[PDB]
Design a protein around this ligand. Structure first.
Ligand SMILES: Cc1cnc(Nc2ccc(C3CCN(C)CC3)c(F)c2)nc1Nc1ccc2c(c1)N(S(=O)(=O)C(C)(C)C)CC2
Length: 125
């Protein structure tokens, strides 16, 4: 059985719109979403469908771009670093579950390099 997906709404947490959070949605998330390599990362890993019974035994902090998109839309992050951490979790999860040189790993590495290039242009705090 898959776990419930990550929470994406926190109605009691204060909310703010900032230049950095807007950029993370409209530039960073949007660019990664549209990359040819994005599809495996756009929704939670369906370990039942993929027949990966060990996935959620190994990966205890799952994260995906669909969740990150919803969190940005719902103002779930107060600080830009919370969102960056989620992207980093998604990439490292791929490296943890898989092995160096696997196709999925090479795909995540390319997405991570593009991510870091976009974060290099994050608007000033
Ligand atoms: C976020 C993430 C992290 N880690 C993995 N690992 C992983 C390991 C083994 C297998 C199966 C797959 C290979 N055969 C078929 C038997 C063993 C696997 F499906 C995934 N998947 C992920 N997502 C993800 C989602 C959907 C799909 C994916 C991947 N693929 S895919 O094969 O990776 C690709 C993209 C075509 C290269 C198929 C569709």
């Amino acid at each position: 059985m898959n776990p419930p997906p990550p929470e994406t709404s926190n109605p009691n947490k204060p909310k703010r719109q900032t230049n950095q959070l807007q950029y993370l949605l409209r530039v960073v998330l949007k660019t990664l979403w549209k990359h040819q390599f994005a599809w495996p990362f756009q929704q939670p890993v369906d370990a039942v469908k993929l027949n990966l019974p060990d996935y959620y035994k190994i990966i205890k902090t799952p994260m995906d771009m669909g969740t990150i998109k919803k969190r940005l839309e719902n103002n779930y992050y107060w600080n830009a670093q919370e969102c960056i951490q989620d992207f980093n979790t998604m990439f490292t999860n791929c490296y943890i579950y898989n092995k160096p040189g696997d196709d999925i790993v090479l795909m995540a590495e390319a997405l991570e390099k593009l991510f870091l290039q976009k974060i290099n242009e994050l608007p000033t705090e």
